Design an enzyme around this catalytic site. Structure first.
Site, PDB file in Angstrom:
ATOM      1  N   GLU A 191       0.915  -1.366  -0.005  1.00 67.58           N
ATOM      2  CA  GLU A 191       0.012  -0.003   0.031  1.00 67.58           C
ATOM      3  C   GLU A 191       0.700   1.238   0.215  1.00 67.58           C
ATOM      4  O   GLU A 191       0.639   2.095   0.735  1.00 67.58           O
ATOM      5  CB  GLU A 191      -0.981  -0.042   1.186  1.00 67.58           C
ATOM      6  CG  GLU A 191      -2.091  -1.028   1.070  1.00 67.58           C
ATOM      7  CD  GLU A 191      -3.575  -0.807   1.998  1.00 67.58           C
ATOM      8  OE1 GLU A 191      -3.697   0.388   2.246  1.00 67.58           O
ATOM      9  OE2 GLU A 191      -4.136  -1.736   2.047  1.00 67.58           O
ATOM     10  N   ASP A 336       1.089  -8.710   2.771  1.00 62.77           N
ATOM     11  CA  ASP A 336      -0.278  -8.856   3.466  1.00 62.77           C
ATOM     12  C   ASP A 336      -0.990  -9.700   2.877  1.00 62.77           C
ATOM     13  O   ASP A 336      -1.365  -9.620   1.587  1.00 62.77           O
ATOM     14  CB  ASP A 336      -0.766  -7.397   3.525  1.00 62.77           C
ATOM     15  CG  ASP A 336      -2.099  -7.301   3.995  1.00 62.77           C
ATOM     16  OD1 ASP A 336      -2.720  -8.417   4.300  1.00 62.77           O
ATOM     17  OD2 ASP A 336      -2.645  -6.147   3.914  1.00 62.77           O
ATOM     18  N   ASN A 338      -3.775 -11.248   3.714  1.00 64.53           N
ATOM     19  CA  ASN A 338      -5.190 -11.262   3.921  1.00 64.53           C
ATOM     20  C   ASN A 338      -5.675 -12.715   4.370  1.00 64.53           C
ATOM     21  O   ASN A 338      -6.851 -12.960   3.887  1.00 64.53           O
ATOM     22  CB  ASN A 338      -6.081 -10.348   2.795  1.00 64.53           C
ATOM     23  CG  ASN A 338      -6.018  -8.909   2.804  1.00 64.53           C
ATOM     24  OD1 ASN A 338      -6.282  -8.479   4.079  1.00 64.53           O
ATOM     25  ND2 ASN A 338      -5.789  -8.600   1.928  1.00 64.53           N
TER      26      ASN A 338
END
Ligand SMILES: Cn1c(-c2c[nH]c3cc(C#N)ccc23)nc2ccc(C(=O)N3CCO[C@@H](c4ccccc4)[C@@H]3CO)cc21
Ligand SMILES: [Mg+2]
Length: 449
Positions: A191, A336, A338
């Site tokens: 991100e 990440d 998730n």
């Protein structure tokens, strides 16, 4: 002659947070640069000057600026500096001579900063760069400004967060301090906004000896930073999962299983997740090369099957890079993901197989069901284990982030402890005045087995 092509100070400055100048050099060496920091003698002492005829030039340098004893590129203001503007005097050099000296004043004053951040205690474990035998590795979803600025993030996801603490300038100060304070060797970030990479991360981390590479997803992307004194970048093998799955014969078998489920196929092929792959060479032992992968998998809570397929593409691509293009080099796979430790994707990573009757093959409902069996040959383990959570927001919390390592080639020497549940919930959840992301950075010290 040595000269600065770019010379910029940050838009926002806080007491206890590093002021990291942005600089680009022409015809000069970065180790030859000279720096001297000045601070206003009093809040509001220095009035910006207009041009005057050369014959009426000041008879003495301005009494409105005080010389600090800081000769470093980075300046960290004290609380005694609150309300002052700063001025950097710097000179470019090539090792033999110096170009013209430059001066730059901050537009902003030094603002008060938070008294404590969650990484302060963690920084007590990372005061020094690790020895040549270790690899301090970081994985961190730093929360993209493109998402944090939306009304959904401000009022639905993080309404408990002080609105000023969600702003890019404040969070970037915290992220710069956090990451530089880890004194790391391999930093994998998710991100990362384009401007965050160029204007915040590169200026801060290059001051501490790290170089970075960036790969866009759609609105933000992935970054990998490496400590130049310990690693060189050899080659890059970045992919988009949908492109590799549809076009590359490496994933031929996986695609055969997926095309039997047209709805699940269309959903996977419309995902924009990417995989960043960087092959690094140890500067201390040229026979030591490492394959550093970094990803950010599909976010949806019911996206279990999609993450399984993206992971299957990622591991087959990493196998090719680390075992075909290179002769079986160790893998570090950050991201990440998730995915919590009780999911199909996590079971697949750790066990090297997943049965076709796993509940995650129907994670997003019956229409998008895609039961299949998958296997991979890697022996991987989570370097920071299974923390109670790595993502903690008002509406959800879970362990979503990992530093996966080749357990036969690498071993964990230290895990930098995550903040306690009490510390995480000081301002209800994350992000906060004290924590600049909805995720918690994973940090560990690895060694070659
Ligand atoms: C991880 N997660 C779950 C979630 C809850 N339970 C889970 C369990 C598992 C598992 N296993 C995986 C995910 C979730 N629910 C979520 C809702 C939102 C976001 C989010 O913040 N984003 C996703 C959408 O795109 C972005 C965005 C766009 C516009 C506005 C704001 C954000 C951003 C990128 O990371 C993440 C969530
Ligand atoms: Mg998020």
């Amino acid at each position: 002659p040595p000269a600065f092509t770019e010379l910029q100070l940050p838009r926002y400055i806080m007491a206890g947070f590093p002021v990291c100048p942005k600089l680009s050099l022409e015809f000069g060496d970065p180790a030859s640069s000279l720096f001297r920091w000045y601070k206003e003698a009093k809040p509001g002492a220095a009035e910006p000057e207009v041009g005057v005829p050369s014959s009426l030039s000041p008879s003495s340098p301005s009494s409105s600026w005080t010389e600090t004893d800081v000769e470093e590129r980075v300046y960290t203001p004290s609380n005694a500096d609150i309300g002052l503007r700063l001025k950097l005097h710097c000179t470019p050099g090539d090792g033999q001579r110096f170009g013209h000296s430059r001066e730059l004043e901050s537009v902003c004053v030094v603002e008060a900063g938070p008294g404590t951040c969650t990484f302060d205690h963690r920084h007590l474990y990372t005061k020094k760069v690790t020895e040549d035998a270790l690899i301090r590795t970081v994985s961190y979803n730093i929360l993209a400004d493109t998402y944090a600025q939306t009304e959904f993030s401000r009022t639905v996801l993080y309404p408990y967060c002080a609105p000023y603490a969600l702003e890019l300038d404040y969070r970037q100060n915290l992220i710069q301090k956090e990451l530089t304070g880890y004194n790391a060797d391999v930093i994998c970030l998710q991100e990362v906004d384009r401007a965050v990479f160029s204007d915040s991360l590169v200026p801060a981390l290059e001051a501490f000896g790290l170089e970075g590479v960036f790969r866009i997803k759609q609105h933000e992307g992935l970054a990998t930073f490496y400590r130049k004194s310990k690693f060189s970048l050899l080659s890059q093998h970045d992919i988009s999962f949908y492109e590799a799955l549809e076009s590359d014969p490496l994933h031929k078998e996986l695609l055969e299983k997926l095309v039997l489920y047209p709805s699940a196929q269309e959903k996977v092929l419309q995902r924009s997740s990417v995989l960043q792959v960087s092959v690094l060479q140890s500067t201390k032992d040229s026979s030591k090369r490492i394959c550093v992968a970094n990803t950010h998998l599909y976010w949806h809570p019911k996206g279990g099957y999609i993450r399984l397929i993206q992971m299957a593409v990622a591991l087959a691509h990493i196998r090719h890079v680390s075992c075909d293009l290179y002769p079986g080099i160790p893998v570090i796979f950050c991201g990440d993901f998730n995915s919590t430790p009780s999911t199909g994707m996590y079971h697949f990573v750790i066990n090297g197989s997943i049965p076709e009757d796993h509940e995650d093959w129907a994670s997003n409902g019956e229409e998008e069901r895609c039961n299949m069996s998958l296997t991979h040959f890697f022996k991987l383990k989570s370097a920071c284990g299974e923390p109670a959570y790595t993502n903690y927001v008002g509406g959800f919390h879970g362990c979503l982030d990992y530093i996966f390592i080749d357990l036969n080639a690498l071993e964990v020497e230290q895990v930098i402890p995550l903040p306690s549940h009490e510390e995480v919930t000081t301002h209800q959840a994350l992000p906060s005045v004290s924590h600049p992301s909805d995720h918690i950075a994973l940090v560990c010290d690895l060694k070659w087995k």
